[PDB]
Amino acid sequence: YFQGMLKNIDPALNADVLHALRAMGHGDTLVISDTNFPSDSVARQTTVGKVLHIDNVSAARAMKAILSVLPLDTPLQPSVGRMEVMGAPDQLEPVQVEVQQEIDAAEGKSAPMYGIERFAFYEKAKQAYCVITTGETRFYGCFLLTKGVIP
Amino acid sequence: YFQGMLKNIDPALNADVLHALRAMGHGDTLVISDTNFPSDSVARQTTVGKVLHIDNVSAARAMKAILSVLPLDTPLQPSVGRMEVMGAPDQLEPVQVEVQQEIDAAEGKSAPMYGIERFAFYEKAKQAYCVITTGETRFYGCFLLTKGVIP
């Protein structure tokens, strides 16, 4: 839906998502979740308190939309966390490699995601500013972003 | 305050204003108000139901920020209304000429504001999606914008 789209802002960012992205401080986090993650329960614990959506799109498409406006904290710390595949900390899934492309495109440099164990990922998610769920059905399609700061 | 600013989005647009601008449909209206207008009472009647703010800035600075993201309905109808100076429908105040510059800059063509009588302006304001007040202290510093549509 293109309805109500604004000038030079990715139309996939709906009003509730734009609000969250703008209201977050430097160092605040958000989760982009797939359809598998328990987004409803986890979102109840976040600052926003309800699940936000970039619906029907892949995790990579969601990442592209979010990073088109959101600076990442890359100059100061690795700023996109991914889930670790069980028993294989270095393994990347197709859904994850696609998302990495969007991060590197937004940064204009290599910015590899850092791994987070499943349990730790859930606990970090509960401390996020918001959860933004997507149409991503593939396993391990969740990411933890840390907002940076524009000079 | 630059805190939390996003990439390529005028930082004067806070989260509540960005939300409103994105959530409005084609043909929805908003009021940019000066400090003189009864923004609190009028805003209670709008869709948003509370006064939004681009604080401390002039009406023209507010217009610049809003039009940096908001398409106007100019291809279809005159899309910025101004208050008519009492007994002088064609007269423009300094606050109004400044705002016209921002409109023409955003449109890249001449798009003269249309006049609205005081009483009509108030009644239209009550039907707006939102009122966004500013630091504009000068008289007649209120405007009625109509959202357009991007192809």
PDB file of C-alpha atoms in Angstrom:
ATOM      1  CA  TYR A   1       0.000   0.000   0.000  1.00  0.00           C
ATOM      2  CA  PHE A   2       1.344   3.280  -1.237  1.00  0.00           C
ATOM      3  CA  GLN A   3      -1.517   5.222   0.273  1.00  0.00           C
ATOM      4  CA  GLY A   4      -0.412   8.396   2.038  1.00  0.00           C
ATOM      5  CA  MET A   5       3.246   7.967   1.076  1.00  0.00           C
ATOM      6  CA  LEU A   6       5.563  10.921   1.826  1.00  0.00           C
ATOM      7  CA  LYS A   7       8.276  12.532  -0.287  1.00  0.00           C
ATOM      8  CA  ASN A   8      11.589  10.608  -0.261  1.00  0.00           C
ATOM      9  CA  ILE A   9      10.595   8.307   2.607  1.00  0.00           C
ATOM     10  CA  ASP A  10      10.311   4.527   1.908  1.00  0.00           C
ATOM     11  CA  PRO A  11       6.519   3.947   1.790  1.00  0.00           C
ATOM     12  CA  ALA A  12       6.870   0.589   3.626  1.00  0.00           C
ATOM     13  CA  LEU A  13       7.447   2.635   6.800  1.00  0.00           C
ATOM     14  CA  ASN A  14       3.950   3.166   8.168  1.00  0.00           C
ATOM     15  CA  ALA A  15       3.071   5.923  10.637  1.00  0.00           C
ATOM     16  CA  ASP A  16       3.513   3.788  13.815  1.00  0.00           C
ATOM     17  CA  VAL A  17       6.957   2.571  12.586  1.00  0.00           C
ATOM     18  CA  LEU A  18       8.099   6.082  11.569  1.00  0.00           C
ATOM     19  CA  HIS A  19       7.078   7.340  15.012  1.00  0.00           C
ATOM     20  CA  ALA A  20       9.126   4.611  16.746  1.00  0.00           C
ATOM     21  CA  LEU A  21      12.159   5.138  14.552  1.00  0.00           C
ATOM     22  CA  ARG A  22      12.103   8.914  15.159  1.00  0.00           C
ATOM     23  CA  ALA A  23      11.394   8.682  18.930  1.00  0.00           C
ATOM     24  CA  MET A  24      14.234   6.261  19.707  1.00  0.00           C
ATOM     25  CA  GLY A  25      17.413   7.646  21.266  1.00  0.00           C
ATOM     26  CA  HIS A  26      21.031   6.921  20.389  1.00  0.00           C
ATOM     27  CA  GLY A  27      21.702   3.397  21.566  1.00  0.00           C
ATOM     28  CA  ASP A  28      18.068   2.327  21.804  1.00  0.00           C
ATOM     29  CA  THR A  29      17.377  -1.035  20.138  1.00  0.00           C
ATOM     30  CA  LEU A  30      14.622  -2.531  17.998  1.00  0.00           C
ATOM     31  CA  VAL A  31      13.876  -6.076  16.829  1.00  0.00           C
ATOM     32  CA  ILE A  32      12.902  -6.938  13.262  1.00  0.00           C
ATOM     33  CA  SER A  33      11.087 -10.261  13.674  1.00  0.00           C
ATOM     34  CA  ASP A  34      10.013 -13.082  11.363  1.00  0.00           C
ATOM     35  CA  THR A  35       6.632 -14.811  11.653  1.00  0.00           C
ATOM     36  CA  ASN A  36       8.116 -17.508  13.899  1.00  0.00           C
ATOM     37  CA  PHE A  37       9.213 -15.304  16.796  1.00  0.00           C
ATOM     38  CA  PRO A  38       6.655 -14.755  19.615  1.00  0.00           C
ATOM     39  CA  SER A  39       6.331 -11.110  18.696  1.00  0.00           C
ATOM     40  CA  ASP A  40       3.051 -10.477  20.518  1.00  0.00           C
ATOM     41  CA  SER A  41       4.247 -11.650  23.901  1.00  0.00           C
ATOM     42  CA  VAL A  42       7.707 -10.062  23.565  1.00  0.00           C
ATOM     43  CA  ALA A  43       6.287  -6.727  22.323  1.00  0.00           C
ATOM     44  CA  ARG A  44       4.168  -6.383  25.533  1.00  0.00           C
ATOM     45  CA  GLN A  45       7.499  -5.889  27.366  1.00  0.00           C
ATOM     46  CA  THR A  46       8.931  -3.254  25.000  1.00  0.00           C
ATOM     47  CA  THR A  47       8.664   0.528  25.318  1.00  0.00           C
ATOM     48  CA  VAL A  48       6.037   0.657  22.560  1.00  0.00           C
ATOM     49  CA  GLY A  49       4.095  -2.169  24.243  1.00  0.00           C
ATOM     50  CA  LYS A  50       2.493  -3.580  21.079  1.00  0.00           C
ATOM     51  CA  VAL A  51       3.800  -5.275  17.884  1.00  0.00           C
ATOM     52  CA  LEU A  52       4.558  -2.926  14.977  1.00  0.00           C
ATOM     53  CA  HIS A  53       4.565  -4.233  11.379  1.00  0.00           C
ATOM     54  CA  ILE A  54       6.142  -3.896   7.931  1.00  0.00           C
ATOM     55  CA  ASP A  55       3.763  -6.511   6.656  1.00  0.00           C
ATOM     56  CA  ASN A  56       4.184  -9.088   3.933  1.00  0.00           C
ATOM     57  CA  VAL A  57       7.770  -8.123   3.222  1.00  0.00           C
ATOM     58  CA  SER A  58      10.938 -10.200   3.655  1.00  0.00           C
ATOM     59  CA  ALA A  59      13.367  -9.439   6.512  1.00  0.00           C
ATOM     60  CA  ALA A  60      15.796  -7.958   3.961  1.00  0.00           C
ATOM     61  CA  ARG A  61      13.086  -5.673   2.507  1.00  0.00           C
ATOM     62  CA  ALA A  62      12.208  -4.579   6.053  1.00  0.00           C
ATOM     63  CA  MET A  63      15.872  -3.938   6.844  1.00  0.00           C
ATOM     64  CA  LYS A  64      16.170  -1.834   3.664  1.00  0.00           C
ATOM     65  CA  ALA A  65      13.169   0.251   4.670  1.00  0.00           C
ATOM     66  CA  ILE A  66      14.295   0.732   8.261  1.00  0.00           C
ATOM     67  CA  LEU A  67      17.923   1.587   7.403  1.00  0.00           C
ATOM     68  CA  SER A  68      16.795   4.091   4.769  1.00  0.00           C
ATOM     69  CA  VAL A  69      15.984   6.382   7.738  1.00  0.00           C
ATOM     70  CA  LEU A  70      17.651   4.818  10.796  1.00  0.00           C
ATOM     71  CA  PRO A  71      21.348   5.498  11.426  1.00  0.00           C
ATOM     72  CA  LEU A  72      23.106   2.477  12.991  1.00  0.00           C
ATOM     73  CA  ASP A  73      25.619   2.780  15.846  1.00  0.00           C
ATOM     74  CA  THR A  74      28.354   1.188  13.645  1.00  0.00           C
ATOM     75  CA  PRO A  75      31.039   3.867  14.298  1.00  0.00           C
ATOM     76  CA  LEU A  76      30.846   2.938  17.992  1.00  0.00           C
ATOM     77  CA  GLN A  77      29.825  -0.760  18.185  1.00  0.00           C
ATOM     78  CA  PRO A  78      28.564  -3.628  16.016  1.00  0.00           C
ATOM     79  CA  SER A  79      24.927  -2.592  15.601  1.00  0.00           C
ATOM     80  CA  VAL A  80      23.032  -5.434  14.055  1.00  0.00           C
ATOM     81  CA  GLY A  81      22.681  -8.677  16.010  1.00  0.00           C
ATOM     82  CA  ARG A  82      21.440 -11.905  14.383  1.00  0.00           C
ATOM     83  CA  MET A  83      20.369 -15.218  15.913  1.00  0.00           C
ATOM     84  CA  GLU A  84      22.991 -17.923  16.186  1.00  0.00           C
ATOM     85  CA  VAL A  85      22.011 -21.137  14.426  1.00  0.00           C
ATOM     86  CA  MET A  86      21.950 -23.817  17.126  1.00  0.00           C
ATOM     87  CA  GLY A  87      25.428 -25.380  17.570  1.00  0.00           C
ATOM     88  CA  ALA A  88      26.933 -23.353  14.701  1.00  0.00           C
ATOM     89  CA  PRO A  89      27.867 -19.810  15.783  1.00  0.00           C
ATOM     90  CA  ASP A  90      29.424 -18.899  12.396  1.00  0.00           C
ATOM     91  CA  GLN A  91      26.705 -20.392  10.180  1.00  0.00           C
ATOM     92  CA  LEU A  92      24.545 -17.990   8.155  1.00  0.00           C
ATOM     93  CA  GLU A  93      21.119 -18.810   6.734  1.00  0.00           C
ATOM     94  CA  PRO A  94      19.887 -17.430   3.376  1.00  0.00           C
ATOM     95  CA  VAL A  95      17.515 -15.042   5.210  1.00  0.00           C
ATOM     96  CA  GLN A  96      20.534 -13.712   7.125  1.00  0.00           C
ATOM     97  CA  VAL A  97      22.846 -13.239   4.131  1.00  0.00           C
ATOM     98  CA  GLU A  98      20.112 -11.256   2.326  1.00  0.00           C
ATOM     99  CA  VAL A  99      19.753  -8.962   5.347  1.00  0.00           C
ATOM    100  CA  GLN A 100      23.540  -8.457   5.545  1.00  0.00           C
ATOM    101  CA  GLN A 101      23.437  -7.095   1.976  1.00  0.00           C
ATOM    102  CA  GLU A 102      21.000  -4.367   3.067  1.00  0.00           C
ATOM    103  CA  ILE A 103      23.163  -3.428   6.017  1.00  0.00           C
ATOM    104  CA  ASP A 104      26.311  -3.153   3.889  1.00  0.00           C
ATOM    105  CA  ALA A 105      24.367  -1.187   1.255  1.00  0.00           C
ATOM    106  CA  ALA A 106      23.120   1.322   3.896  1.00  0.00           C
ATOM    107  CA  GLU A 107      26.594   1.664   5.494  1.00  0.00           C
ATOM    108  CA  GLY A 108      28.509   1.731   2.206  1.00  0.00           C
ATOM    109  CA  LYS A 109      31.072  -0.587   3.874  1.00  0.00           C
ATOM    110  CA  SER A 110      31.271  -4.086   5.338  1.00  0.00           C
ATOM    111  CA  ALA A 111      29.429  -4.204   8.673  1.00  0.00           C
ATOM    112  CA  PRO A 112      29.068  -7.932   9.570  1.00  0.00           C
ATOM    113  CA  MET A 113      26.282  -8.781  12.005  1.00  0.00           C
ATOM    114  CA  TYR A 114      27.276 -10.140  15.393  1.00  0.00           C
ATOM    115  CA  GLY A 115      25.807 -13.397  16.694  1.00  0.00           C
ATOM    116  CA  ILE A 116      23.436 -13.714  19.641  1.00  0.00           C
ATOM    117  CA  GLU A 117      22.445 -17.028  21.286  1.00  0.00           C
ATOM    118  CA  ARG A 118      18.700 -17.817  21.176  1.00  0.00           C
ATOM    119  CA  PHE A 119      18.033 -17.234  24.860  1.00  0.00           C
ATOM    120  CA  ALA A 120      20.057 -14.038  25.031  1.00  0.00           C
ATOM    121  CA  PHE A 121      18.284 -12.814  21.868  1.00  0.00           C
ATOM    122  CA  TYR A 122      14.859 -13.226  23.529  1.00  0.00           C
ATOM    123  CA  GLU A 123      15.993 -11.436  26.659  1.00  0.00           C
ATOM    124  CA  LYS A 124      17.481  -8.549  24.630  1.00  0.00           C
ATOM    125  CA  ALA A 125      14.270  -8.384  22.598  1.00  0.00           C
ATOM    126  CA  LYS A 126      12.268  -7.787  25.781  1.00  0.00           C
ATOM    127  CA  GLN A 127      14.476  -4.734  26.486  1.00  0.00           C
ATOM    128  CA  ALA A 128      14.038  -3.226  23.014  1.00  0.00           C
ATOM    129  CA  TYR A 129      12.165  -0.012  22.213  1.00  0.00           C
ATOM    130  CA  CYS A 130       9.930  -2.003  19.852  1.00  0.00           C
ATOM    131  CA  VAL A 131       9.410  -5.189  17.863  1.00  0.00           C
ATOM    132  CA  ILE A 132       8.622  -4.735  14.186  1.00  0.00           C
ATOM    133  CA  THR A 133       7.349  -7.939  12.628  1.00  0.00           C
ATOM    134  CA  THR A 134       7.372  -8.780   8.910  1.00  0.00           C
ATOM    135  CA  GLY A 135       6.158 -11.345   6.383  1.00  0.00           C
ATOM    136  CA  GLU A 136       9.445 -13.237   6.724  1.00  0.00           C
ATOM    137  CA  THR A 137       8.591 -16.928   7.195  1.00  0.00           C
ATOM    138  CA  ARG A 138      12.079 -18.409   7.116  1.00  0.00           C
ATOM    139  CA  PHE A 139      13.747 -19.637  10.304  1.00  0.00           C
ATOM    140  CA  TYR A 140      16.236 -17.345  12.124  1.00  0.00           C
ATOM    141  CA  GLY A 141      14.839 -14.234  10.457  1.00  0.00           C
ATOM    142  CA  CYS A 142      15.112 -11.972  13.500  1.00  0.00           C
ATOM    143  CA  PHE A 143      17.548  -9.098  14.022  1.00  0.00           C
ATOM    144  CA  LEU A 144      18.443  -6.647  16.783  1.00  0.00           C
ATOM    145  CA  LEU A 145      19.336  -3.117  15.577  1.00  0.00           C
ATOM    146  CA  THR A 146      21.022  -0.400  17.636  1.00  0.00           C
ATOM    147  CA  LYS A 147      20.291   3.208  16.661  1.00  0.00           C
ATOM    148  CA  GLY A 148      23.285   5.421  15.994  1.00  0.00           C
ATOM    149  CA  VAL A 149      23.537   9.186  15.770  1.00  0.00           C
ATOM    150  CA  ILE A 150      23.804  11.659  12.907  1.00  0.00           C
ATOM    151  CA  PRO A 151      26.458  14.448  13.162  1.00  0.00           C
TER     152      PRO A 151
ATOM    153  CA  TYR B   1      16.880  19.530  19.422  1.00  0.00           C
ATOM    154  CA  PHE B   2      18.603  17.240  16.998  1.00  0.00           C
ATOM    155  CA  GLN B   3      18.272  14.268  19.299  1.00  0.00           C
ATOM    156  CA  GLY B   4      17.184  11.099  17.513  1.00  0.00           C
ATOM    157  CA  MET B   5      17.218  12.720  14.068  1.00  0.00           C
ATOM    158  CA  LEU B   6      16.780  10.371  11.077  1.00  0.00           C
ATOM    159  CA  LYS B   7      18.619  10.228   7.757  1.00  0.00           C
ATOM    160  CA  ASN B   8      17.411  12.831   5.219  1.00  0.00           C
ATOM    161  CA  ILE B   9      14.324  13.816   7.221  1.00  0.00           C
ATOM    162  CA  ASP B  10      14.080  17.425   8.551  1.00  0.00           C
ATOM    163  CA  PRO B  11      14.835  17.026  12.293  1.00  0.00           C
ATOM    164  CA  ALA B  12      12.171  19.638  13.217  1.00  0.00           C
ATOM    165  CA  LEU B  13       9.576  16.941  12.450  1.00  0.00           C
ATOM    166  CA  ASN B  14       9.152  15.145  15.764  1.00  0.00           C
ATOM    167  CA  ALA B  15       7.707  11.639  16.067  1.00  0.00           C
ATOM    168  CA  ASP B  16       4.070  12.744  16.702  1.00  0.00           C
ATOM    169  CA  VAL B  17       4.200  15.113  13.666  1.00  0.00           C
ATOM    170  CA  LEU B  18       5.817  12.493  11.389  1.00  0.00           C
ATOM    171  CA  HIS B  19       3.101  10.029  12.406  1.00  0.00           C
ATOM    172  CA  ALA B  20       0.341  12.528  11.524  1.00  0.00           C
ATOM    173  CA  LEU B  21       1.912  13.486   8.222  1.00  0.00           C
ATOM    174  CA  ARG B  22       2.314   9.822   7.202  1.00  0.00           C
ATOM    175  CA  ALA B  23      -1.157   8.706   8.420  1.00  0.00           C
ATOM    176  CA  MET B  24      -3.102  11.415   6.573  1.00  0.00           C
ATOM    177  CA  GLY B  25      -4.884  10.481   3.348  1.00  0.00           C
ATOM    178  CA  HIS B  26      -4.997  12.336   0.043  1.00  0.00           C
ATOM    179  CA  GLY B  27      -7.147  15.383   0.632  1.00  0.00           C
ATOM    180  CA  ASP B  28      -6.886  15.365   4.418  1.00  0.00           C
ATOM    181  CA  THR B  29      -6.026  18.782   5.883  1.00  0.00           C
ATOM    182  CA  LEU B  30      -3.812  20.103   8.668  1.00  0.00           C
ATOM    183  CA  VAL B  31      -3.457  23.522  10.304  1.00  0.00           C
ATOM    184  CA  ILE B  32      -0.106  25.151  11.034  1.00  0.00           C
ATOM    185  CA  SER B  33      -0.963  27.612  13.811  1.00  0.00           C
ATOM    186  CA  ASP B  34       0.723  30.630  15.392  1.00  0.00           C
ATOM    187  CA  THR B  35       0.715  31.266  19.146  1.00  0.00           C
ATOM    188  CA  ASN B  36      -2.404  33.436  18.851  1.00  0.00           C
ATOM    189  CA  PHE B  37      -4.805  30.811  17.511  1.00  0.00           C
ATOM    190  CA  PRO B  38      -6.793  28.797  20.116  1.00  0.00           C
ATOM    191  CA  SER B  39      -4.927  25.649  19.196  1.00  0.00           C
ATOM    192  CA  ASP B  40      -5.800  23.676  22.331  1.00  0.00           C
ATOM    193  CA  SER B  41      -9.543  24.027  21.987  1.00  0.00           C
ATOM    194  CA  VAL B  42      -9.545  23.555  18.195  1.00  0.00           C
ATOM    195  CA  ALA B  43      -7.224  20.511  18.363  1.00  0.00           C
ATOM    196  CA  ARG B  44      -9.724  18.678  20.665  1.00  0.00           C
ATOM    197  CA  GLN B  45     -12.025  18.515  17.602  1.00  0.00           C
ATOM    198  CA  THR B  46      -9.418  17.183  15.148  1.00  0.00           C
ATOM    199  CA  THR B  47      -8.697  13.547  14.288  1.00  0.00           C
ATOM    200  CA  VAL B  48      -5.512  13.599  16.380  1.00  0.00           C
ATOM    201  CA  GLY B  49      -7.416  15.185  19.287  1.00  0.00           C
ATOM    202  CA  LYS B  50      -4.454  17.033  20.828  1.00  0.00           C
ATOM    203  CA  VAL B  51      -2.144  19.895  19.705  1.00  0.00           C
ATOM    204  CA  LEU B  52       1.042  18.818  17.907  1.00  0.00           C
ATOM    205  CA  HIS B  53       4.104  21.114  17.843  1.00  0.00           C
ATOM    206  CA  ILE B  54       7.115  22.258  15.814  1.00  0.00           C
ATOM    207  CA  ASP B  55       8.148  24.439  18.695  1.00  0.00           C
ATOM    208  CA  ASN B  56       9.974  27.740  18.737  1.00  0.00           C
ATOM    209  CA  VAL B  57      10.143  27.986  14.968  1.00  0.00           C
ATOM    210  CA  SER B  58       8.542  30.568  12.664  1.00  0.00           C
ATOM    211  CA  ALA B  59       5.531  29.620  10.501  1.00  0.00           C
ATOM    212  CA  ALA B  60       7.810  29.657   7.434  1.00  0.00           C
ATOM    213  CA  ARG B  61      10.331  27.312   9.113  1.00  0.00           C
ATOM    214  CA  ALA B  62       7.447  25.003  10.058  1.00  0.00           C
ATOM    215  CA  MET B  63       6.098  25.109   6.503  1.00  0.00           C
ATOM    216  CA  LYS B  64       9.575  24.223   5.179  1.00  0.00           C
ATOM    217  CA  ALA B  65       9.784  21.238   7.505  1.00  0.00           C
ATOM    218  CA  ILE B  66       6.281  19.990   6.751  1.00  0.00           C
ATOM    219  CA  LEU B  67       6.551  20.392   2.956  1.00  0.00           C
ATOM    220  CA  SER B  68       9.913  18.608   2.925  1.00  0.00           C
ATOM    221  CA  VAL B  69       7.863  15.395   3.369  1.00  0.00           C
ATOM    222  CA  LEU B  70       4.229  16.325   2.659  1.00  0.00           C
ATOM    223  CA  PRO B  71       3.035  16.451  -0.959  1.00  0.00           C
ATOM    224  CA  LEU B  72       0.420  19.196  -1.500  1.00  0.00           C
ATOM    225  CA  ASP B  73      -2.723  18.690  -3.604  1.00  0.00           C
ATOM    226  CA  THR B  74      -1.623  21.519  -5.979  1.00  0.00           C
ATOM    227  CA  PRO B  75      -2.117  19.547  -9.247  1.00  0.00           C
ATOM    228  CA  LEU B  76      -5.801  19.225  -8.314  1.00  0.00           C
ATOM    229  CA  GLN B  77      -6.713  22.300  -6.200  1.00  0.00           C
ATOM    230  CA  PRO B  78      -5.134  25.270  -4.411  1.00  0.00           C
ATOM    231  CA  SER B  79      -3.718  23.518  -1.346  1.00  0.00           C
ATOM    232  CA  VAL B  80      -2.587  26.114   1.113  1.00  0.00           C
ATOM    233  CA  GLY B  81      -5.187  28.405   2.680  1.00  0.00           C
ATOM    234  CA  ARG B  82      -4.215  31.546   4.628  1.00  0.00           C
ATOM    235  CA  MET B  83      -6.281  33.847   6.841  1.00  0.00           C
ATOM    236  CA  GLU B  84      -7.777  36.916   5.224  1.00  0.00           C
ATOM    237  CA  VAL B  85      -6.731  40.151   6.905  1.00  0.00           C
ATOM    238  CA  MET B  86      -9.951  41.773   8.120  1.00  0.00           C
ATOM    239  CA  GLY B  87     -11.495  43.959   5.369  1.00  0.00           C
ATOM    240  CA  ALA B  88      -8.584  43.357   2.968  1.00  0.00           C
ATOM    241  CA  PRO B  89      -8.896  40.014   1.144  1.00  0.00           C
ATOM    242  CA  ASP B  90      -5.792  40.606  -1.032  1.00  0.00           C
ATOM    243  CA  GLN B  91      -3.512  41.958   1.708  1.00  0.00           C
ATOM    244  CA  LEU B  92      -0.537  39.819   2.761  1.00  0.00           C
ATOM    245  CA  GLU B  93       1.311  40.130   6.064  1.00  0.00           C
ATOM    246  CA  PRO B  94       5.091  39.571   6.382  1.00  0.00           C
ATOM    247  CA  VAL B  95       4.464  36.217   8.127  1.00  0.00           C
ATOM    248  CA  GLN B  96       2.365  35.184   5.114  1.00  0.00           C
ATOM    249  CA  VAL B  97       4.829  36.250   2.408  1.00  0.00           C
ATOM    250  CA  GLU B  98       7.610  34.283   4.156  1.00  0.00           C
ATOM    251  CA  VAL B  99       5.418  31.167   4.180  1.00  0.00           C
ATOM    252  CA  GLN B 100       4.569  31.608   0.476  1.00  0.00           C
ATOM    253  CA  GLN B 101       8.307  31.419  -0.293  1.00  0.00           C
ATOM    254  CA  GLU B 102       8.483  27.962   1.314  1.00  0.00           C
ATOM    255  CA  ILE B 103       5.485  26.754  -0.639  1.00  0.00           C
ATOM    256  CA  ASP B 104       6.907  27.952  -3.965  1.00  0.00           C
ATOM    257  CA  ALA B 105      10.301  26.453  -3.062  1.00  0.00           C
ATOM    258  CA  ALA B 106       8.709  23.029  -2.314  1.00  0.00           C
ATOM    259  CA  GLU B 107       6.561  23.115  -5.495  1.00  0.00           C
ATOM    260  CA  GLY B 108       9.282  24.543  -7.740  1.00  0.00           C
ATOM    261  CA  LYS B 109       6.581  26.816  -9.243  1.00  0.00           C
ATOM    262  CA  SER B 110       4.264  29.633  -8.179  1.00  0.00           C
ATOM    263  CA  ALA B 111       1.470  28.255  -5.983  1.00  0.00           C
ATOM    264  CA  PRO B 112      -0.252  31.312  -4.393  1.00  0.00           C
ATOM    265  CA  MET B 113      -2.185  30.639  -1.196  1.00  0.00           C
ATOM    266  CA  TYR B 114      -5.938  31.108  -1.291  1.00  0.00           C
ATOM    267  CA  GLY B 115      -7.691  33.325   1.252  1.00  0.00           C
ATOM    268  CA  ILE B 116     -10.058  32.115   3.960  1.00  0.00           C
ATOM    269  CA  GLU B 117     -12.249  34.402   6.113  1.00  0.00           C
ATOM    270  CA  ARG B 118     -11.564  34.204   9.875  1.00  0.00           C
ATOM    271  CA  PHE B 119     -14.754  32.378  10.794  1.00  0.00           C
ATOM    272  CA  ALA B 120     -14.522  29.909   7.931  1.00  0.00           C
ATOM    273  CA  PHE B 121     -10.854  29.296   8.832  1.00  0.00           C
ATOM    274  CA  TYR B 122     -11.812  28.295  12.401  1.00  0.00           C
ATOM    275  CA  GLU B 123     -14.547  25.988  11.183  1.00  0.00           C
ATOM    276  CA  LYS B 124     -12.206  24.336   8.641  1.00  0.00           C
ATOM    277  CA  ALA B 125      -9.575  23.984  11.365  1.00  0.00           C
ATOM    278  CA  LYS B 126     -12.009  21.957  13.476  1.00  0.00           C
ATOM    279  CA  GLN B 127     -12.357  19.503  10.552  1.00  0.00           C
ATOM    280  CA  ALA B 128      -8.603  19.065  10.067  1.00  0.00           C
ATOM    281  CA  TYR B 129      -6.636  15.881  10.755  1.00  0.00           C
ATOM    282  CA  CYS B 130      -4.447  17.857  13.172  1.00  0.00           C
ATOM    283  CA  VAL B 131      -3.273  21.254  14.380  1.00  0.00           C
ATOM    284  CA  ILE B 132       0.478  21.757  14.521  1.00  0.00           C
ATOM    285  CA  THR B 133       1.398  24.846  16.500  1.00  0.00           C
ATOM    286  CA  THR B 134       4.688  26.756  16.264  1.00  0.00           C
ATOM    287  CA  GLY B 135       6.673  29.569  17.871  1.00  0.00           C
ATOM    288  CA  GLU B 136       5.182  32.040  15.387  1.00  0.00           C
ATOM    289  CA  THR B 137       3.974  35.066  17.377  1.00  0.00           C
ATOM    290  CA  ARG B 138       2.942  37.340  14.525  1.00  0.00           C
ATOM    291  CA  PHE B 139      -0.730  37.921  13.728  1.00  0.00           C
ATOM    292  CA  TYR B 140      -2.384  35.898  10.911  1.00  0.00           C
ATOM    293  CA  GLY B 141       0.276  33.195  11.071  1.00  0.00           C
ATOM    294  CA  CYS B 142      -2.077  30.262  10.511  1.00  0.00           C
ATOM    295  CA  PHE B 143      -2.346  28.087   7.402  1.00  0.00           C
ATOM    296  CA  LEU B 144      -4.514  25.226   6.160  1.00  0.00           C
ATOM    297  CA  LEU B 145      -2.661  22.581   4.090  1.00  0.00           C
ATOM    298  CA  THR B 146      -4.264  19.891   1.932  1.00  0.00           C
ATOM    299  CA  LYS B 147      -2.270  16.690   1.400  1.00  0.00           C
ATOM    300  CA  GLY B 148      -1.702  15.625  -2.185  1.00  0.00           C
ATOM    301  CA  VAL B 149      -0.582  12.303  -3.598  1.00  0.00           C
ATOM    302  CA  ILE B 150       2.695  10.973  -4.966  1.00  0.00           C
ATOM    303  CA  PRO B 151       2.612   9.013  -8.287  1.00  0.00           C
TER     304      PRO B 151
END
